[PDB]
């Protein structure tokens, strides 16, 4: 899947010729134990990260007018997907493995 | 031998490298090439000048003029005889204070033995004394000349001092601007501080002495000797009860503040004093080129060479031409308006247009402070106007045929401002008595085009929105008023013209008729209409009535046109139409737009968006019960005391367009969110204090009334309703002062303060301050200001607020570097003087040395040039650089710090400089020098009064000037200066304190905790390329808009638009379709510029 996503992304930049990415990194890097036990819905609600997501979807649906073209918004939605896959599928398992003083 | 032969008896030699006593008066001043004062060389200036003032023939001979001022009559001559005798007693006080100084601690004995007592901070007056036996005495020529300057200063100092705003008072006191107490500002501008009084007095003393400064003499003597004399004269005036000294202690209000400030007020003369008709006799008798005078007929004021209080900046040739045209206008006195003022009297004027008499036993302490300030402005304006009338009345028998000219100068923001305190351009009372406009109309028929102009002027003066309706509709509205409510007032005015008398109840008649339309301009409309009714010949009516071409939201509209980049959007097209810019509509006026197209202005548009943001905020915290209650309390409190907030019986919130007037204007002015919150809270507290006064009034009438009915008696239909409102008020105040919201991690949490409001109130001295005031502002900032700022951004545009951020960062960073280099360069020079034997600490630097330091800053581009205007954002006058005392008096009091002209940090002042300077400041400069410019007009900022005979033609020219000012590029001018600064700056030589300030503007919070010098330098260069991208986009947008047909009606009073003769038709198109057409031309312009740079089948 990762190889397929990269090819499509590079093929869109040829035709067309930031803040929430940090909050999701803090969600997958939690080291408390009493916070991760409440689920992921609570952390996202407490993390305020739901606000940057609302702005992008409002342009796609058409509720809020914007001057960006189709290729500008497509590059934005596909950039959020790769951020969650990088953080939750690759960085989260390293946090769990870092609590042991040994290599299992 | 030049100055050494005029004062040969002064103590000490004139050599800088001598052994004994050196005279620093002769080492710092030199004789001028041509004489400037008539008292130089005389023996008794106080007696020679007094002799010249004893007759008209002697006055002409001394001044060497054919004839003297006609106002210099016998009564004025008699009054000046007593003033001269008063000045002789002032000299006796000074001569007695010097003898005491030389007697205490054997100062005179030591000074005669060789001790350098004249170099002390308090002994600087020993440089103008002469040896007399075994003691010393003053120099008669120098002492008596300084006394004459004090007499002239005592007469006209008040009418020339500047006006202090809230920002200036905060800097002097040190208290925060948003936490200024009640009445502190009104107390400060009543008098003058020690620095203001001494510096202004010392300026006149130097002028009367008639000498020239030595550029190679230390600033501690060229500026200290005149200052030491000013402090001694001011002390003598206090002893003579001419000046009253008051001391205000900052520890009473803020115990953490230990500053002490003294205020001096000059005792005023009687309003019937004959000396008020000619108070500049002394000035015109001493100076060859007098500065204080009033210009009559062919006397034209000269053109200034430098900006106001900005000596480092000189007026451009384009700016000097505008000043010359404005000073050639002739003003005239309207006799019917003058007689009405004096017949009514000063008491009835204050009762009508002011607060009237005050009974302090039934008023709140804070409420009474504001009422006095309102009365002071009206009373002072009334006194100033009638002093001018007395002088004009002496020039000729017909007071209405004497032309008057006024002086002008350029403000630091490129604004033409009349000199003086109260003039037609500043005071509304004086505006209705002296006019530059005139017209002759044919009013014999009601269907004439001349009568339509007469009706338009009257309607606008009676508070009618003439720019939102057609001519026919406006005429119908005016007719109802004339035959309805205004009929009793017109009948009284008709009798006044024929007879000249008024009834005892004239104030009540005008109050009932006018009501909410009461104003000074509305009084002239009643008189002008009544004069027309009794005119025997209506075909040649002559009137000074005018029509004002007022811009519709001049501030915000200019910003969205000059500092907006990127592609065009349909929202911008719709919103810019409310300003008067129409695309695709030929010959369209503003009256047609409001009547048929859109009846909402920019103020109403932002109010609607504020409601949308407020609803979203409440829905976010729907599940948070404590947060919901806090928002309800804030809205409930504002509903009780503000007419723009209303809550329905179902809880629905309704807002009016008047709640966003002030926030929108100051948002463009660079004011932060905290500034808006402080002003919004101040409006609520003013209404609360006023309601406390009603409690005292109700208690006096009925001592058995209830507390609820004494407060909300007229706001409740029944007693039970009144009890409901009282419970709301007590609960809201306690809630809003007990807990405050704290924004952390992006969410709001309620935090208790422990300083809630408890106890029983006292209406006489109820006050909100301290921690209670700060709690109110915290709630207002996070619950009302944040939704308000989101609505404003949605209307003006997201791109406009992006340009303001980069402009603020670029200007602040440049000012920080300039301030640090200036301070680092004067400390190296001072360290060099420590090796000079002929130098003593306290002499400071030299004017020649100070100019070299400023010249070394030229490679950093401290000034911004637009081709016709010049700006210097960082320029200021501060005493931080010197950090030492200049001079005191003989009692070791009245210590004056030394202040020099040095750069200072800008802050948020960059945005107002370019929004106003390149906005309405440039528009009015063009209007005064354009081809076929209008004549006989008064140019107030974003306004213009036009006579009734030229309303159509002058309005079209005003719109033409607006279009010219919209072709500028303020961002490009800033970028050119910032690009040169980055080329020569060196961050490695900055102080550690300076590097911390730059990091607060170029880096984020997390990146500036341990940022290095390289990180700061790299971040500063990013702003350089951001300005370049913004500037390029603005240039292209103006090029595209010039190719299409446009109609400009920014000045919407008359309805005479201006056409840009574009050759592309965009009519019969929706705003969505027009944006696509405009964006097509935008992409074509970019391609051509890039292409230019690159350059059978």
Contacts of B651 (CB under 8 A, 6+ apart): none
Residue B332 β-bridge partners:
B435
Which region, left, alpha or beta, applies to residue B942 given φ > 0 means left and ψ of -120 to 50 means alpha? left
Strand partners, B262: B247
Q: What are phi and psi of B260, to 5 degrees?
A: -125, 130
Cβ contact (<8 Å) for A67 and B566?
yes
Mutate which: B747, B797, B1072, B1079, vs A, most A CBs within 10 A? B747
CB contact under 8 A, A48 and B569: no
Partners of B333 in the beta sheet? Answer: B434
CA distance B225 to B119: 11
Question: Quick check: A3 contacting B, CB < 8 Å?
Answer: no
Enumerate the residues of chain A whose CB falls inside 8 A of the CB of residue B747: 46, 48
Q: DSSP letters along B92-124, please?
A: HHHHHHHHHHHHGGGHHHHHTTT--GGGSSS-G
Going by C-alpha positions, the residue among B984, B981, B1023 that lies closest to residue B1002 is B1023
* DSSP code per residue over B344-379: H-HHHHHHHHS--S--GGGS-HHHHHHHHHHHHHHH
Integer Cα distance of B66 and B855 in angstroms: 48
Which residues does residue B871 pair with via DSSP β-bridges, in sequence order?
A: B864
Structure tokens at A41: 């819905």
Given a contact cutoff of 8 angstroms between Cβ atoms, the answer to whether B24 and B10 are in contact is: no
Query: Chain A: residue nearest B798 by CA?
Result: A66
User: Cα torsion at B704, B707, B708, B709 (round to 10°)?
Assistant: 40
The technique by which this structure was obtained is: cryo-EM
Using a CB-CB distance cutoff of 8 angstroms, which residues of chain A are in contact with residue B1033?
A: none
Picking from A67, A68, A69 by the largest number of B CB atoms within 10 A of its own CB, the best residue to mutate is: A67
- The H or E element spanning position B627 is helix B625-641
Going by their DSSP bridges, the two strands B212-213 and B29-30 should be labelled as: antiparallel
Q: CB neighbours (10 Å) of residue B614?
A: 21
A-chain CB neighbours of B1004 within 8 Å are: none
CA–centroid distance for B202 within its chain: 25
**Distance from C-alpha of B578 to C-alpha of B593, rounded to nearest angstrom:** 8
Reference B780, options B734, B741, B732; nearest CA is B741
Residue among A46, A47, A67 whose CB faces B569 most closely: A67
B543, B456 Cβ separation under 8 angstroms:
no
Residue B932 zone, left/alpha/beta (φ > 0; ψ -120 to 50; rest): left
Q: Which helix (H) or strand (E) holds B979?
A: helix B970-984
- Determine contact, residues B198/B245, Cβ cutoff 8 Å: no
User: Can you tell me the distance from the alpha carbon of B1040 to that of B1062, in angstroms, rounded to the nearest whole number?
Assistant: 10
Q: Decide if B220 contacts B844 (C-beta within 8 A).
A: yes
Q: How many CA atoms lie within 13 A of B340 on its CB side?
A: 24
Pairwise CA distance, residues B921 & B697, whole Å: 48
CA atoms within 13 A on the CB side of B581: 18
CB-neighbour burial class of residue B267 (10 A; exposed 0-12, middle 13-18, buried 19+): exposed
Long-range contacts of A84-92 (CB under 8 A, 24+ apart): A84/A24, A85/A2, A87/A24, A87/A25, A87/A27, A87/A28, A88/A28, A91/A25, A91/A28, A91/A29, A92/A28
The nearest CA of chain A is from the CA of B1007 a distance in Å of 14
Q: Which residues of A touch B1005 (CB under 8 A)?
A: none
Q: Cα–Cα distance between B264 and B598 in angstroms, integer?
A: 55
Instruction: Kindly determine whether residue A67 and residue B746, on different chains, have CB atoms separated by under 8 Å.
Output: no
Distance CA B950, CA B833 (A): 66
**Which residues of B are annotated binding-site positions for ATP?**
428-431, 550-555, 661-662
Contact B592, B701 (CB under 8 A): no
CA torsion through residues B787, B793, B798, B800, sign: negative
Q: How far is CA B634 from CA A30, B695, B1016, in A?
A: 37, 23, 42
Closest CA to B233 of B87, B434, B362: B87
Please state, in angstroms and rounded to a whole number, the distance separating the CA atoms of residues B85 and B80.
Answer: 9
Tokens 């006191």 found at: B173
**Residue A22 near chain B (CB below 8 Å):** no
Cβ-Cβ contacts under 8 Å for B874 (sequence gap 6 or more): B814, B815, B818, B819, B862, B903, B904, B905, B906
Residues of chain A with C-beta less than 8 angstroms from the C-beta of B570: 65
- A48 shares contact with chain B (CB less than 8 Å): yes
For residue B28, what are the CA distances in angstroms to B53, B826, B888?
33, 21, 19
Q: Which run of H or E residues covers position B29?
A: strand B29-30
Report which DSSP code applies to B291: S
Q: What is the largest CA-CA distance in chain B?
A: 118
For residues B523 and B511, what is the distance between their CA atoms, to the nearest angstrom? 11
């Amino acid at each position: 899947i990762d190889r397929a996503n990269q090819y499509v992304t590079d093929s869109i930049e040829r035709l067309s010729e930031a803040h929430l990415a940090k909050l999701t990194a803090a969600i997958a890097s939690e080291k408390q134990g009493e916070i991760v036990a409440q689920g992921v819905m609570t952390a996202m609600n407490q993390g305020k990260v739901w606000q940057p997501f609302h702005d992008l979807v409002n342009d796609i649906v058409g509720r809020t007018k914007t001057n960006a073209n189709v290729y500008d918004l497509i590059k934005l939605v596909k950039s959020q997907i790769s951020q969650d896959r990088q953080q939750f599928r690759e960085h989260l398992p390293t946090v769990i493995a870092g609590k042991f003083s040994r290599k299992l | 031998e030049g100055i050494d032969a005029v004062y040969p008896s002064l103590v000490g030699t004139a050599d800088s490298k001598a052994e004994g006593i050196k005279n620093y008066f002769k080492l710092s001043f030199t004789l001028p090439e041509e004489q400037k004062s008539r008292t130089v060389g005389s023996e008794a200036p106080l007696k020679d000048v007094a002799q010249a003032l004893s007759s008209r023939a002697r006055y002409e001979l001394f001044t060497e003029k054919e004839t003297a001022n006609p106002a210099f009559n016998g009564e004025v001559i008699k009054r000046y005889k007593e003033l001269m005798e008063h000045g002789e007693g002032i000299a006796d006080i000074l001569r007695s204070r010097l003898a005491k100084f030389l007697n205490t601690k054997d100062v005179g004995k030591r000074f005669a033995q060789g001790t350098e007592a004249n170099r002390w901070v308090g002994g600087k007056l020993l440089n103008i004394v002469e040896q007399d036996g075994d003691t010393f005495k003053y120099n008669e020529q120098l002492l008596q000349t300084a006394v004459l300057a004090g007499l002239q200063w005592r007469l006209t100092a008040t009418s020339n001092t500047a006006i202090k705003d809230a920002k200036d008072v905060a800097a002097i006191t040190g208290i925060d601007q948003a936490l200024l107490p009640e009445g502190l500002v009104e107390q400060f501008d009543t008098g003058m501080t020690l620095t203001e009084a001494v510096s202004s007095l010392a300026q006149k003393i130097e002028s009367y002495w008639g000498l020239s400064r030595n550029p190679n003499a230390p600033l501690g003597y060229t500026k200290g000797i005149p200052t030491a004399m000013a402090a001694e004269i001011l002390a003598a005036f206090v002893e003579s009860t001419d000046v009253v000294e008051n001391i205000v202690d900052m520890s009473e209000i803020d115990p953490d503040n230990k500053k002490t400030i003294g205020l001096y007020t000059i005792t005023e003369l009687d309003s019937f004093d004959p000396i008020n008709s000619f108070p500049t006799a002394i000035e015109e008798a001493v100076l060859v080129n007098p500065t204080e005078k009033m210009f009559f007929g062919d006397d034209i004021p000269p053109v200034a060479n430098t900006q106001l209080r900005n000596p480092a900046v000189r007026n451009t040739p384009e700016q000097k031409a505008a000043l010359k045209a404005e000073q050639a206008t002739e003003f005239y006195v309207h006799t019917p308006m003058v007689q009405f003022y004096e017949t009514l009297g000063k008491d009835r004027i204050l009762e009508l247009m002011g607060a009237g008499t005050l009974n302090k036993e039934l008023l709140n302490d804070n409420h009474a402070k504001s009422l006095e300030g309102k009365n002071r402005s009206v009373e002072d304006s009334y006194n100033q106007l009638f002093s001018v009338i007395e002088q004009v009345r002496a020039q000729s028998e017909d007071i209405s045929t004497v032309p008057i000219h006024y002086a002008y100068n350029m403000t630091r923001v490129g604004r033409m401002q009349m000199l003086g305190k109260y003039n037609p351009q500043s005071a509304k009372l004086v505006r209705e008595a002296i006019l530059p406009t005139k017209a002759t109309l044919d009013l014999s028929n009601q269907n004439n085009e001349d009568f339509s102009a007469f009706q338009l002027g009257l309607a606008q003066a009676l508070d009618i929105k003439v720019h939102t309706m057609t001519r026919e509709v406006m005429s119908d509205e005016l007719t109802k008023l004339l035959e309805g409510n205004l009929k009793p007032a017109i009948d009284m005015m008709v009798e006044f013209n024929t007879t000249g008398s008024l009834p005892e109840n004239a104030v009540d008649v005008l109050n009932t008729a006018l009501g909410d339309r009461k104003s000074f301009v509305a009084l002239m409309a009643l008189m002008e209409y009544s004069r027309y009714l009794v005119a025997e010949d209506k075909s040649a009516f002559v009137t000074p009535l005018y029509v004002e071409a007022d811009g519709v939201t001049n501030g915000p509209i200019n910003a969205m046109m000059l500092m907006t980049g990127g592609l065009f959007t349909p929202d911008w097209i719709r919103n810019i139409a409310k300003g008067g810019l129409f695309i695709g509509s030929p010959n369209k006026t503003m009256n047609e737009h409001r009547s048929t197209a859109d009846n909402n202005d920019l103020y109403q548009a932002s109010t609607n968006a504020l409601m949308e943001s407020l609803g979203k905020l409440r829905s976010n915290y729907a599940s948070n019960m404590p947060i919901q209650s806090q928002i309800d309390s804030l809205l409930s409190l504002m509903d009780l005391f503000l007419p723009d907030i209303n809550l329905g019986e179902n809880g629905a919130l309704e807002l009016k367009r008047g709640i966003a007037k002030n926030p929108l204007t100051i948002t463009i002015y660079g004011s932060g969110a905290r500034g808006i919150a402080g002003k919004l809270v101040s409006s609520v507290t003013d209404a609360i204090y006023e309601r406390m006064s009603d409690v005292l009034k109700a208690r006096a009438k009925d001592p058995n009334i209830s507390a609820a009915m004494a407060m909300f008696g007229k706001q409740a239909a029944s007693e039970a309703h009144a009890e409901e409102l009282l419970a709301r008020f007590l609960k809201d105040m306690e809630t809003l002062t007990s807990t405050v919201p704290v924004k952390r991690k992006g969410v709001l949490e309620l935090q208790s303060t422990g300083t809630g409001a408890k106890g029983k109130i006292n209406p006489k001295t109820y006050t909100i301050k301290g921690e209670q005031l700060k709690a109110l502002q915290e709630n207002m900032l996070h619950f009302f200001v944040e939704p308000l700022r989101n609505g404003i951004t949605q209307t003006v545009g997201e791109s406009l607020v992006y340009s303001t951020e980069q402009l603020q960062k670029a200007t602040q960073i440049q000012s920080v570097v300039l301030e640090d280099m200036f301070k680092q360069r004067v400390q190296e020079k001072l360290a060099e003087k420590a090796k000079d034997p002929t130098w003593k600490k306290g002499d400071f630097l030299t004017q020649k040395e100070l100019n070299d330091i400023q010249a070394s800053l030229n490679n950093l581009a401290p000034m911004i040039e637009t081709g016709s205007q010049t700006f210097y954002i960082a320029g200021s006058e501060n005493a931080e650089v010197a950090n030492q005392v200049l001079a005191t008096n003989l009692d070791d009091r009245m210590r004056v710090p030394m202040s020099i002209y040095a750069p200072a940090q800008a802050g948020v002042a960059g945005i107002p400089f370019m929004t106003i300077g390149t906005g309405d400041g440039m528009m009015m400069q063009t209007l005064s020098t354009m081809k076929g410019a209008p004549k006989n007009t008064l140019k107030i900022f974003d306004g213009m009064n036009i006579g009734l005979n030229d309303i159509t033609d002058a309005s079209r020219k005003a719109n033409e000037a607006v279009y010219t000012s919209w072709q500028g590029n303020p961002i490009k001018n800033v970028y050119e200066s910032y690009a040169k600064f980055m080329k020569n700056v060196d961050f490695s030589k900055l102080s550690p304190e300076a590097l911390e300030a730059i990091g607060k503007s170029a880096l984020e919070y997390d990146q500036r905790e341990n940022a290095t010098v390289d990180d700061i330098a790299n971040a500063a260069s990013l702003i350089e390329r951001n300005l370049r991208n913004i500037a390029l986009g603005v240039d292209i947008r103006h090029k595209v808009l010039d190719k299409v047909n446009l109609s400009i009606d920014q000045m919407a009073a008359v309805g005479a638009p201006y056409q840009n003769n574009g050759k592309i038709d965009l009519s019969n198109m929706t705003p969505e379709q027009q944006a696509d057409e405009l964006n097509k031309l935008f992409r074509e312009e970019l391609e051509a510029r890039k292409q230019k740079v690159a350059k059978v089948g």
